[PDB]
Amino acid sequence: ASVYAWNRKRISNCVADYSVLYNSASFSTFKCYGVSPTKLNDLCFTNVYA
Amino acid sequence: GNYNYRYRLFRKSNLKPFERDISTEIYQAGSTPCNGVEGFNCYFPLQSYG
Incomplete structure (x- = not known):
């Protein structure tokens, strides 16, 4: 979707x-601001809102 | 910006009481090993306060 009508x-x-999401190397940016990436599992x- | 003061952003385990870590070895933040080289999910442990 576009950014003014972002899909939730x-x-x-x-x-x-x-x-699987964290170990994927295709992502150029993986930055968390309230949790830890290694503690998501x-x-x-x-x-979760995506 | 006074960037001379640094804190350990990344470490594998919590310290002992009265334990000091000055080792400037690279951290492996992903599944891929870093081999002492920065890259994807390979970060310096010491980052400066702004």
Whole structure:
């Protein structure tokens, strides 16, 4: 989508494998501002907005 | 900007009490080994306060 109409996907009621997302080398920027990248597979959240 | 004061942004494990780490070895922040060379998910541990 465009940036004025950014698509919001609700990630909920599922188990999330952030290790595949983090170990992918295609991403040129992986910067977190409230959590740790190595602790995404350990923490639990109510829902995720993408 | 006074950049002469630095803190250890990245380390593998928490320190002991009264333990000092001055080792300027590279950190591996991803699955790919760094081999002492900066790159993707390879960062210097010491970053300066602005």
